[PDB]
Design a protein around this ligand. Structure first.
Ligand SMILES: *[C@@H]1O[C@H](CO)[C@@H](O)[C@H](O)[C@H]1NC(C)=O
Ligand SMILES: [Zn+2]
Lengths: 588, 194
């Protein structure tokens, strides 16, 4: 009659039924994502509907066992994971309204027009064109056709979601999104949600000295791109950042390059001449993993996976993904070619499947990552290690006599920094703004004002036109129009370099960290696997402590990775001013 | 010559809980066709050497046949515990016999999914060695007695295996035959040639 025994007995039946229904749904979805017809969608819809109905009914039944009385931690975590899932229910009348609002907010984003549609043409015009007027035209037009048509919808969305958040014992919706990082366990392994808003901020205080230098180096480089249109001591204009939003600065490499007379490493021509194929890339990727102490891929992977576009007239989307269908079924789907970026993406997806295979022995409800940010941080370090000159020289794509001149490291580090460092303040600012909006710190009538004040104070980007309260700029982003979390990227960026530092120190390497390689090293593989096999059965603090040796986020490895770039940059900024002042406007 | 082909290559097998039991006596058995079959996965023999199984001989040989999953094969061994090793089929510690298992994915898998193989996952007490149970009474978990219908804290005691062709290795069907030897006071009747 003990509650723990009843919970155990209930979960024993639940696992067995779920392991079949989920597999059927996953196979039905794979059928659609592989072959696109008019009959596969019906089967996919039926399978997904049945799975959702079963999950909701079981979640409703599983709320009679209190989570406080159960003492065993594994059973308690399984019950907590089952009860909260499917608990998003307050009333049918308001649920219908919320669903309709979400659908109509999602559909307007896709079919927007300026007549140029976003994805084919606007992205290209934002990423290639070098004219002031055209870029400002596109920026203002896109923020006028979609932004001005979403303010009331989002104003209703915030209050309707806050009601649902309050009804479910949480404080607000921000507290709901921050519940993924809650950890309960031993004395030193407890992490509270309200702590995260502090920790993130602390880490950013260490990244400001680096990013600021970069903000100067880019600015003095745009001086030549446009003669007399940007300030020599103020913030950068918004539309000249390489994208529609400024999320990534990767498109500014051509203008902002230290030495343009030395081309970077390219192996596509050698790969074509040596006579490689799509399967050879995956064979080499598997050989990379078998040499560190991780299992080789299964027989069914080769027989069932799609590794090239089929020419039999079928239609495939073939966006590179890795699937874990359950019951020992692991597949990778990708349109493969004979370039280098596909070679790196192969390692990324291979790392995903290795992580999936690590915790296949855990119970059903605990077969996920420790937190939302580990699962891609595991896959990025593999590409970082497999894109190095030493690995390519070993594998034969480069001659042995080839050397690495200092300019090559400087250029490669600048290219990496324009992608990794530049995207952190944007994410931090957007997440902070939505958290404050949800909580209620910012009244309903001062949204855009505070948004641009934060943009001028944190990121350092100024608007070209005056925006009143009618407009709504944050809603233009895809991750906001369709509701999604955004702090995952900020966590992943720190985790991927902390893991890399730990593994490289364990792999007995000397010198700068960006020339590391974990090939032919079983100790690093064992250290990584000790965490990969843990799964979600333990709090993420212990999982992090099993690789690095700490309990929280540390930013020192990220700053160590960019030390040569920092030292070089400090030399070229002596005859310039570092920083910005928020009193200058392009329109006045 | 008693027909080992009657059980080894039979068209249909039995479930774990209703496992098939066969008695073999008054014949000659040539084990050289089995150990050197070169088409088996596991051939673990306990209490008797595999090569010395052609000289010393017993009176009665009992063959137990069923089908199980892939990762549950390790549970058919002396002293092991689990879910099918304590509720469905149990082996005593002092076991003198052999366990043979092999893959059968080509036969016991369907594109839609086989579902006619059953096993037990709820019981009041562990099975005594060499015992079977085929009762279909509703398992009683909570204090409230449930009669004829299963509801809260009451469940049916049998479930089915979801065998499908595109599974892994530890989820594919495996056919298992266990041979047990008896050496009672009765005179010997069965063993190999001269
Ligand atoms: C059952 O069939 C197999 C399959 O060829 C064959 O070896 C023989 O007839 C039987 N097996 C044994 C071990 O005798
Ligand atoms: Zn990935």
């Amino acid at each position: 009659s003990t509650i723990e025994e009843l919970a155990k007995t209930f979960l024993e039946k639940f696992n067995q039924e779920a392991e079949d229904l989920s597999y059927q749904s996953a196979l039905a979805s794979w059928d659609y994502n592989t072959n696109i017809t008019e009959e596969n969608v019906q089967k996919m819809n039926d399978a997904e509907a049945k799975w959702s109905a079963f999950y909701e009914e079981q979640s409703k039944l599983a709320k009679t066992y209190p989570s406080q009385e159960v003492q065993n931690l594994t059973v308690k975590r399984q019950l907590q994971a089952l009860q909260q899932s499917g608990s998003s229910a307050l009333s049918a009348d308001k649920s219908k309204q919320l669903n309709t609002i979400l659908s109509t907010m999602s559909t307007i984003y896709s079919t927007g027009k300026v007549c140029f549609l976003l994805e084919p043409g606007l992205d290209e015009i934002m990423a290639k064109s070098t004219d002031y007027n055209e870029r400002l035209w596109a920026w203002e037009g896109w923020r006028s056709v979609v932004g001005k048509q979403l303010r009331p919808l989002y104003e209703e969305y915030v209050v309707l979601k806050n009601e649902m958040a309050r009804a479910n014992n949480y404080e607000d919706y921000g507290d709901y999104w921050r519940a993924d990082y809650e950890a309960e366990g031993a004395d030193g392994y407890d992490y509270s949600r309200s702590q995260l808003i502090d920790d993130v901020e602390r880490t950013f205080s260490e990244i400001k000295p680096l990013y600021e230098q970069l903000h100067a180096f880019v600015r003095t480089k745009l001086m030549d791109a446009y003669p007399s249109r940007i300030s020599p001591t103020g913030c950068l204009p918004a539309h000249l950042l390489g994208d529609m939003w400024g999320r990534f600065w990767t498109n500014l490499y051509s203008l902002t390059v230290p030495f343009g007379q030395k081309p970077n490493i390219d192996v596509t021509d050698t790969m074509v001449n040596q006579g490689w194929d799509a399967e050879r890339i995956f064979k080499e990727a598997e050989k990379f993993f078998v040499s560190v102490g991780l299992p080789s891929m299964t027989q069914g992977f080769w027989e069932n996976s799609m590794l090239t576009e089929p020419g039999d007239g079928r239609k495939v989307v073939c966006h590179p993904t890795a699937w874990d269908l359950g019951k020992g079924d692991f597949r990778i789907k990708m349109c493969t070619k004979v370039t280098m970026d596909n070679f790196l993406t192969a390692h990324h997806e291979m790392g995903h499947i290795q992580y999936d295979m690590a915790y296949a022995t855990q119970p059903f409800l605990l077969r996920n990552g420790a937190n939302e940010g580990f699962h891609e941080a595991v896959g990025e370090i593999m590409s970082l290690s497999a894109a190095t000159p030493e690995h390519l020289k070993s594998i034969g794509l480069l001659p042995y006599d080839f050397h690495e001149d200092n300019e090559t490291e400087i250029n490669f580090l600048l290219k990496q920094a324009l992608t990794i460092v530049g995207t952190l303040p944007f994410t931090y600012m957007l997440e902070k703004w939505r958290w404050m909006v949800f909580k209620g710190e910012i009244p309903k009538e001062q949204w855009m004002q505070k948004w641009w004040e934060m943009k001028r104070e944190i990121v350092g980007v100024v608007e070209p036109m005056p925006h009143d309260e009618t407009y709504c700029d944050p809603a233009a982003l895809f991750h906001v129009a369709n509701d999604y979390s955004f702090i995952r990227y900020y966590t992943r960026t720190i985790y991927q370099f902390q893991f890399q530092e730990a593994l490289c120190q364990a792999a007995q390497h000397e010198g700068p960290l960006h020339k590391c390689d974990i090939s032919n090293s079983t100790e690093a593989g064992q250290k990584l696997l000790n965490m990969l096999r843990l799964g979600r059965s333990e709090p993420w603090t212990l999982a992090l402590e099993n690789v690095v040796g700490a309990k929280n986020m540390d930013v020192r490895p990220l700053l160590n990775y960019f030390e040569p770039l920092f030292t070089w940059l400090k030399e070229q900024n002596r005859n310039s001013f570092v920083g910005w002042s928020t009193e200058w406007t392009p329109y006045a | 010559l008693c027909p080992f082909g009657e059980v080894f290559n039979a068209t249909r097998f039995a479930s774990v809980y209703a496992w098939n039991r066969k008695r073999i006596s008054n014949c000659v058995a040539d084990y050289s066709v089995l150990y050197n079959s070169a088409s088996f996965s596991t051939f673990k023999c306990y209490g008797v050497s595999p090569t010395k199984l052609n000289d010393l001989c017993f009176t009665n040989v009992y063959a137990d046949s069923f089908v199980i999953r892939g990762d549950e094969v390790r549970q058919i061994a002396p002293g092991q515990t689990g879910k099918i090793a304590d509720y469905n089929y149990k082996l005593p510690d002092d076991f003198t016999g052999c366990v043979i298992a092999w893959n059968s994915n080509n036969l016991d898998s369907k594109v839609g999914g086989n579902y006619n193989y059953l096993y037990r996952l709820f019981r009041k007490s562990n099975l005594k060695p060499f015992e079977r149970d085929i009762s279909t009474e509703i398992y009683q978990a909570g204090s409230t007695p449930c009669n004829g219908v299963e509801g809260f804290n009451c469940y049916f005691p049998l479930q089915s295996y979801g065998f499908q062709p595109t599974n892994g290795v530890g989820y594919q069907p495996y056919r298992v035959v266990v041979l047990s030897f008896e050496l009672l006071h009765a005179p010997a009747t069965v063993c190999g040639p001269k």
